[PDB]
Amino acid sequence: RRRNLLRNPCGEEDLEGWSDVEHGGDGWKVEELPGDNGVEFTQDDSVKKYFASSFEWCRKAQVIDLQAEGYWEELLDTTQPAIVVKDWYSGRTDAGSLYELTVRLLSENEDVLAEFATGQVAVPEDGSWMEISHTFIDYGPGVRFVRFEHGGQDSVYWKGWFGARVTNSSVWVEP
Amino acid sequence: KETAAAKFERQHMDSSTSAASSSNYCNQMMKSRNLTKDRCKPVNTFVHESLADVQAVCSQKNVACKNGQTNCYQSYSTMSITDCRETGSSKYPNCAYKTTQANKHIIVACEGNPYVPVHFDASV
Numbered sequence: 449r450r451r452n453l454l455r456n457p458c459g460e461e462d463l464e465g466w467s468d469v470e471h472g473g474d475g476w477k478v479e480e481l482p483g484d485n486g487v488e489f490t491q492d493d494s495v496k497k498y499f500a501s502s503f504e505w506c507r508k509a510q511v512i513d514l515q516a517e518g519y520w521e522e523l524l525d526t527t528q529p530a531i532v533v534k535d536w537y538s539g540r541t542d543a544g545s546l547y548e549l550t551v552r553l554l555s556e557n558e559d560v561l562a563e564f565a566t567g568q569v570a571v572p573e574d575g576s577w578m579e580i581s582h583t584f585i586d587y588g589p590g591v592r593f594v595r596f597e598h599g600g601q602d603s604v605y606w607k608g609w610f611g612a613r614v615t616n617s618s619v620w621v622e623p
Numbered sequence: 624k625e626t627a628a629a630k631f632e633r634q635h636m637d638s639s640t641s642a643a644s645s646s647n648y649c650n651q652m653m654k655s656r657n658l659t660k661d662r663c664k665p666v667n668t669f670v671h672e673s674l675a676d677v678q679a680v681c682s683q684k685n686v687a688c689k690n691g692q693t694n695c696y697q698s699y700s701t702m703s704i705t706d707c708r709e710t711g712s713s714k715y716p717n718c719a720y721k722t723t724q725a726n727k728h729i730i731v732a733c734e735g736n737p738y739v740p741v742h743f744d745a746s747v
């Protein structure tokens with residue numbers, strides 16, 4: 449009740465598990481909570497680390513295979529269970545930054561059958577944490593993968609790690 | 624990368640100010656927009672208009688870029704600008720500059736979609 453299908457949501461294991469890592473600027477850097485000039489993570493004390501972006505877009509994805517993880521075609525097709533994505537993001541209090549999240553459902557031909565996508569958005573400049581959540585339902589038949597991609601950068605073009613901060617990401621399936 | 628469009632923003636737009644704000648302005652803007660990163664950029668211009676207004680130039684008088692291409696656009700109004708030129712005795716990493724206030728039409732080069740300014744070409 450319920451299992452996160454994303455490897456290494458908080459950089460406990462640096463960047464293992466994530467693919468299409470794009471290192472913009474001085475790339476991604478794992479840091480500890482609350483980071484340099486940012487607010488406390490209030491609501492899951494098990495979370496000790498976020499990933500930080502730099503001065504050009506940093507991205508990263510994971511392509512989750514619903515079968516490798518334990519589901520199967522006719523289940524997905526007849527029951528069509530809810531697939532839930534959450535992400536957590538923030539910015540520093542001493543620079544602004546941008547966030548973007550794009551999450552898609554793929555057929556096994558890898559046609560996008562459903563998408564949930566923010567566009568690039570300005571991260572609250574008070575530095576506060578944002579949870580972002582979508583639930584996919586009645587997406588229809590042939591969902592084989594969930595692709596989860598997010599990214600960040602600063603909007604100040606600084607050296608260092610002044611971009612958006614991401615952590616605690618999850619995808620799961622539920623009744 | 625950074626796009627060749629956010630570049631142009633970084634190197635040429637300063638919307639938050641009206642005109643140059645003291646003689647030290649070129650020194651600060653060349654630094655903070657990172658035109659002094661490994662070499663001193665010899666020459667540079669900033670534009671003290673809203674980003675919108677500068678976007679607009681792209682659909683205005685089409686002229687020959689000073690390098691003889693095609694896709695250059697003069698602005699209809701003249702704008703508030705600041706030229707920055709190295710001082711004799713600028714030496715990296717103490718890059719140093721002369722500020723020059725002006726109010727002239729600018730000529731930018733646009734490209735891609737959306738159709739945005741991508742180089743600063745000349746002022747008139």
Ligand SMILES: *[C@@H]1O[C@H](CO)[C@@H](O[C@@H]2O[C@H](CO)[C@@H](O[C@@H]3O[C@H](CO[C@H]4O[C@H](CO)[C@@H](O)[C@H](O)[C@@H]4O)[C@@H](O)[C@H](O[C@H]4O[C@H](CO)[C@@H](O)[C@H](O)[C@@H]4O)[C@@H]3O)[C@H](O)[C@H]2NC(C)=O)[C@H](O)[C@H]1NC(C)=O
Nearest residue numbers: 484485503542543604605606607608609654655656657660
């Ligand atoms: C290109 O352009 C210039 C090259 O000089 C660089 O600009 C500097 O960028 C640095 C960091 O990369 C900035 O440093 C940060 O400054 C922060 C804000 O301070 C402002 O406000 C305070 C008021 O308290 C003043 O001291 C000052 O006027 C500043 O403008 C500080 O908050 C930061 O410190 C915090 O974060 C670091 C964590 O990294 C911690 O070490 C500190 O303890 C603290 O938590 C930080 O120091 C600096 O301000 C920039 N100069 C300016 C004014 O632009 C760009 O970095 C460079 N970028 C590229 C692409 O090369």
